[PDB]
Amino acid sequence: RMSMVVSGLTPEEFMLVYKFARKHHITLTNLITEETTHVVMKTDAEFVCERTLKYFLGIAGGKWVVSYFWVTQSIKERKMLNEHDFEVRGDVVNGRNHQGPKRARESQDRKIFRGLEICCYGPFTNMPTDQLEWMVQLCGASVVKELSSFTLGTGVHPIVVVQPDAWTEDNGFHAIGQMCEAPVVTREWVLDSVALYQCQELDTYLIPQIP
């Protein structure tokens, strides 16, 4: 049935969602899981939100990603206004009008990471690796833990995702192409890809690999 988590809300706001939840017998939880069906986002008048992990895992799961205005309107009209009319068009990074969650809900038989082996390599921040990993799996990638664990052959397409920030290194990420044969890119390829729910050409995200 219905199970929600919220993102970007204040307690009073959260208490309103609780109110909503109790009235409609909807489950409400702290952590987003398989079962989670809705992700309630803080947005602006025009349904743009910030990009939070829950935002991403929401889209990655093709769950309902709906503006907080869904809640308050329902309350304000003693009834559940269908999710359809409160979705988030976009975010403060990937554009105010990309229909991300929309697309996602509309393509679980063809996921942006069809035929991809991804290795999240090195350290990340604000987002634990396993969550980024979970993300890409929800999009149909296959997680690989070690650079050397890539499935050789051709059937598949390998990719190394890094986040330069969390590195404070010398010969670290400029030199990944030395220990494997895959394109290397920043986390932004994934997040951007998931936001728009369109598989983004590596072009813009590749990191300089030494020979």
């Binding site: 970007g8 910030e50 990009r51 939070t52 992990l53 990074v93 604000n126 987002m127």
Partner: peptide, 4 residues
């Protein structure tokens, strides 16, 4: 929550 953190933003990205």
């Amino acid at each position: 929550s953190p933003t990205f």
